[PDB]
Amino acid sequence: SFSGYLKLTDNVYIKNADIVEEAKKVKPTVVVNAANVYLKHGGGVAGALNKATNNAMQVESDDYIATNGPLKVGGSCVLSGHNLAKHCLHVVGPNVNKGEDIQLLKSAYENFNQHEVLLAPLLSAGIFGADPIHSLRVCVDTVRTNVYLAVFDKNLYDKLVSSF
Ligand SMILES: O=S1(=O)CCC[C@@H](CNc2ncnc3[nH]ncc23)C1
């Protein structure tokens, strides 16, 4: 199962890890993707997850968008987890670099409550522009199901733990 995570709360756990490598090893029921509304998985967590599926995530995602249109900022959809997980929960956090309202980060984390356990990144952090310390605080104060957070950067992981 999940191993080497530091327990932060009753339901939130954290580890310095690449979420792609964690998903390949653990094969969780749900891996969260840090998606954008178009499901265009170019970089960050989305680009890395999609590359690990040999672009199968992007082919599925383009069919989903052709049928349904774009997601909302703060919204999500459940698609296949391909070779990484049973399911991928594509969740759109606000992108601060595009002036999206950071208050939508709590709505984005509420999607996690529909799943008993998830492997996830810190939403809206990284290339989405938000402060990761804030993202972890909104995660702990919003998600009630069991979440295993993979933080790619070691320096940031240590700062997140030491300021918790
Ligand atoms: O640690 S960071 O520099 C700042 C906090 C948010 C993460 C978001 N990206 C990722 N998080 C987890 N696993 C990943 N694999 N590929 C990308 C990625 C980036």
Tab-separated table of C-alpha atoms and ligand atoms in Angstrom:
chain	number	residue	atom	x	y	z
A	1	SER	CA	0.000	0.000	0.000
A	2	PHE	CA	1.092	3.668	0.517
A	3	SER	CA	4.426	3.738	2.305
A	4	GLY	CA	6.728	6.275	3.869
A	5	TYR	CA	4.083	8.987	4.289
A	6	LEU	CA	4.179	11.394	7.221
A	7	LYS	CA	0.804	11.670	8.958
A	8	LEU	CA	-0.382	15.301	9.189
A	9	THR	CA	-3.978	14.795	10.406
A	10	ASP	CA	-6.542	12.020	10.933
A	11	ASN	CA	-6.967	11.788	7.119
A	12	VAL	CA	-4.094	13.674	5.400
A	13	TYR	CA	-0.667	12.101	4.709
A	14	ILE	CA	2.303	13.603	2.837
A	15	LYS	CA	5.471	12.365	1.083
A	16	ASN	CA	8.259	13.855	-1.084
A	17	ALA	CA	7.596	11.860	-4.253
A	18	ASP	CA	6.816	12.130	-7.937
A	19	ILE	CA	3.095	11.269	-8.161
A	20	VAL	CA	3.785	9.297	-11.397
A	21	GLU	CA	6.282	7.028	-9.616
A	22	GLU	CA	3.937	6.630	-6.613
A	23	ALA	CA	1.041	5.711	-8.920
A	24	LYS	CA	3.153	3.164	-10.855
A	25	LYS	CA	4.244	1.461	-7.644
A	26	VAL	CA	1.004	1.591	-5.643
A	27	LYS	CA	-1.615	1.339	-8.471
A	28	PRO	CA	-4.159	3.241	-6.281
A	29	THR	CA	-7.914	3.188	-6.846
A	30	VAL	CA	-7.769	6.948	-7.627
A	31	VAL	CA	-4.960	9.188	-8.784
A	32	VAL	CA	-5.764	12.949	-8.978
A	33	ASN	CA	-4.618	14.930	-11.946
A	34	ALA	CA	-3.982	18.708	-11.678
A	35	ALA	CA	-6.048	19.346	-14.766
A	36	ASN	CA	-7.043	22.437	-16.723
A	37	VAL	CA	-10.570	22.973	-18.071
A	38	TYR	CA	-9.646	21.720	-21.543
A	39	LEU	CA	-7.911	18.557	-20.238
A	40	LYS	CA	-4.817	19.572	-22.241
A	41	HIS	CA	-2.146	17.666	-20.318
A	42	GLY	CA	0.959	19.581	-21.401
A	43	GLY	CA	3.128	19.983	-18.328
A	44	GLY	CA	3.277	19.759	-14.548
A	45	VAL	CA	1.469	16.809	-12.993
A	46	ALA	CA	-0.852	16.497	-16.037
A	47	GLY	CA	1.949	16.322	-18.583
A	48	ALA	CA	3.851	13.820	-16.438
A	49	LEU	CA	0.808	11.544	-15.865
A	50	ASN	CA	-0.140	11.681	-19.525
A	51	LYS	CA	3.427	10.823	-20.693
A	52	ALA	CA	3.373	7.779	-18.361
A	53	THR	CA	0.207	6.548	-20.110
A	54	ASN	CA	1.909	6.861	-23.558
A	55	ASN	CA	-0.657	9.638	-24.419
A	56	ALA	CA	-3.663	7.360	-23.818
A	57	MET	CA	-4.885	9.849	-21.127
A	58	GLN	CA	-4.834	12.688	-23.693
A	59	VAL	CA	-6.695	10.592	-26.365
A	60	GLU	CA	-9.404	9.719	-23.816
A	61	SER	CA	-9.532	13.298	-22.575
A	62	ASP	CA	-9.990	14.752	-26.095
A	63	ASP	CA	-12.979	12.430	-26.665
A	64	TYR	CA	-14.420	13.537	-23.266
A	65	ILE	CA	-14.082	17.256	-24.173
A	66	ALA	CA	-15.532	16.678	-27.676
A	67	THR	CA	-18.636	15.166	-26.034
A	68	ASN	CA	-19.012	17.312	-22.916
A	69	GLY	CA	-17.182	20.589	-23.390
A	70	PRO	CA	-14.731	22.011	-20.901
A	71	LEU	CA	-14.814	21.508	-17.160
A	72	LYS	CA	-15.451	24.390	-14.760
A	73	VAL	CA	-12.601	25.849	-12.664
A	74	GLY	CA	-13.199	24.058	-9.331
A	75	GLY	CA	-14.766	21.064	-11.086
A	76	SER	CA	-13.751	17.526	-11.928
A	77	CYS	CA	-14.423	14.458	-13.963
A	78	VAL	CA	-13.589	10.766	-13.449
A	79	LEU	CA	-11.798	9.065	-16.332
A	80	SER	CA	-9.646	5.916	-16.629
A	81	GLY	CA	-6.428	5.645	-14.620
A	82	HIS	CA	-4.891	3.673	-17.544
A	83	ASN	CA	-1.656	1.912	-16.353
A	84	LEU	CA	-1.383	4.155	-13.270
A	85	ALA	CA	-4.560	3.688	-11.223
A	86	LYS	CA	-8.094	2.282	-11.546
A	87	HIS	CA	-9.411	5.847	-12.087
A	88	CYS	CA	-8.023	9.306	-12.642
A	89	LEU	CA	-9.962	12.126	-10.986
A	90	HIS	CA	-9.144	15.202	-13.148
A	91	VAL	CA	-9.563	18.203	-10.853
A	92	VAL	CA	-9.243	21.848	-11.977
A	93	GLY	CA	-7.793	24.143	-9.355
A	94	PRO	CA	-7.649	27.915	-10.078
A	95	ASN	CA	-4.648	29.071	-12.049
A	96	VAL	CA	-3.465	32.241	-10.290
A	97	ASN	CA	-1.256	33.122	-13.246
A	98	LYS	CA	-4.530	33.554	-15.285
A	99	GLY	CA	-6.274	35.668	-12.541
A	100	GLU	CA	-8.614	32.850	-11.454
A	101	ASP	CA	-10.139	33.251	-8.006
A	102	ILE	CA	-8.056	31.401	-5.369
A	103	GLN	CA	-11.315	30.857	-3.379
A	104	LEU	CA	-12.146	28.230	-6.066
A	105	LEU	CA	-9.336	26.061	-4.560
A	106	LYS	CA	-11.675	24.949	-1.762
A	107	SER	CA	-14.333	23.932	-4.361
A	108	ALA	CA	-11.614	21.996	-6.234
A	109	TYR	CA	-10.623	20.036	-3.097
A	110	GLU	CA	-14.298	19.249	-2.324
A	111	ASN	CA	-14.262	16.881	-5.317
A	112	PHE	CA	-11.923	14.627	-3.298
A	113	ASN	CA	-14.721	13.904	-0.798
A	114	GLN	CA	-16.491	11.733	-3.367
A	115	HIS	CA	-13.679	9.109	-3.085
A	116	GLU	CA	-12.662	7.153	0.027
A	117	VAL	CA	-8.949	7.274	-0.659
A	118	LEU	CA	-6.844	9.176	-3.209
A	119	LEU	CA	-3.255	9.724	-4.286
A	120	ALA	CA	-3.020	13.471	-5.111
A	121	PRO	CA	-0.813	16.459	-5.752
A	122	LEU	CA	-1.192	19.893	-4.107
A	123	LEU	CA	-3.802	21.588	-6.297
A	124	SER	CA	-3.090	25.013	-7.819
A	125	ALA	CA	0.574	24.830	-6.727
A	126	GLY	CA	3.518	24.355	-9.112
A	127	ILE	CA	2.851	25.829	-12.544
A	128	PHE	CA	-0.674	26.906	-11.494
A	129	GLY	CA	0.884	29.701	-9.447
A	130	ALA	CA	-0.587	29.368	-5.933
A	131	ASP	CA	1.295	29.190	-2.661
A	132	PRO	CA	1.737	25.493	-1.772
A	133	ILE	CA	1.512	26.252	1.965
A	134	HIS	CA	-1.970	27.682	1.313
A	135	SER	CA	-2.900	24.706	-0.886
A	136	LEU	CA	-1.993	22.233	1.894
A	137	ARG	CA	-4.031	24.232	4.428
A	138	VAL	CA	-7.111	24.257	2.186
A	139	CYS	CA	-6.624	20.496	1.568
A	140	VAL	CA	-6.504	19.700	5.348
A	141	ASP	CA	-9.503	21.963	6.070
A	142	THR	CA	-11.661	20.676	3.156
A	143	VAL	CA	-10.920	17.020	2.406
A	144	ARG	CA	-12.480	14.496	4.867
A	145	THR	CA	-11.575	11.295	2.956
A	146	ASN	CA	-8.092	9.749	3.069
A	147	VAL	CA	-5.645	11.677	0.951
A	148	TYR	CA	-2.020	10.792	0.251
A	149	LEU	CA	-0.203	13.887	-1.020
A	150	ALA	CA	2.836	13.484	-3.212
A	151	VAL	CA	5.014	16.686	-3.247
A	152	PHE	CA	7.557	16.519	-6.044
A	153	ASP	CA	10.026	19.084	-4.653
A	154	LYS	CA	12.099	18.051	-1.546
A	155	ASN	CA	12.883	21.614	-0.458
A	156	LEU	CA	9.175	22.500	-0.574
A	157	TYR	CA	8.151	19.222	1.154
A	158	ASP	CA	10.461	20.077	4.079
A	159	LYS	CA	9.039	23.622	4.299
A	160	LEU	CA	5.442	22.298	4.204
A	161	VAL	CA	6.138	19.844	7.060
A	162	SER	CA	8.122	22.339	9.179
A	163	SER	CA	5.460	25.049	8.988
A	164	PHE	CA	2.413	22.738	9.457
B	1	LIG	O1	6.529	20.408	-5.954
B	1	LIG	S1	6.241	21.451	-6.920
B	1	LIG	O2	7.346	22.087	-7.595
B	1	LIG	C1	5.241	22.669	-6.125
B	1	LIG	C2	4.017	21.986	-5.515
B	1	LIG	C3	3.105	21.365	-6.560
B	1	LIG	C4	3.806	20.313	-7.418
B	1	LIG	C5	2.896	19.935	-8.557
B	1	LIG	N1	3.567	19.033	-9.493
B	1	LIG	C6	3.797	17.739	-9.230
B	1	LIG	N2	3.432	17.208	-8.043
B	1	LIG	C7	3.653	15.895	-7.871
B	1	LIG	N3	4.217	15.021	-8.717
B	1	LIG	C8	4.530	15.576	-9.903
B	1	LIG	N4	5.058	14.937	-10.970
B	1	LIG	N5	5.236	15.803	-12.011
B	1	LIG	C9	4.826	16.982	-11.585
B	1	LIG	C10	4.360	16.920	-10.248
B	1	LIG	C11	5.073	20.881	-8.104
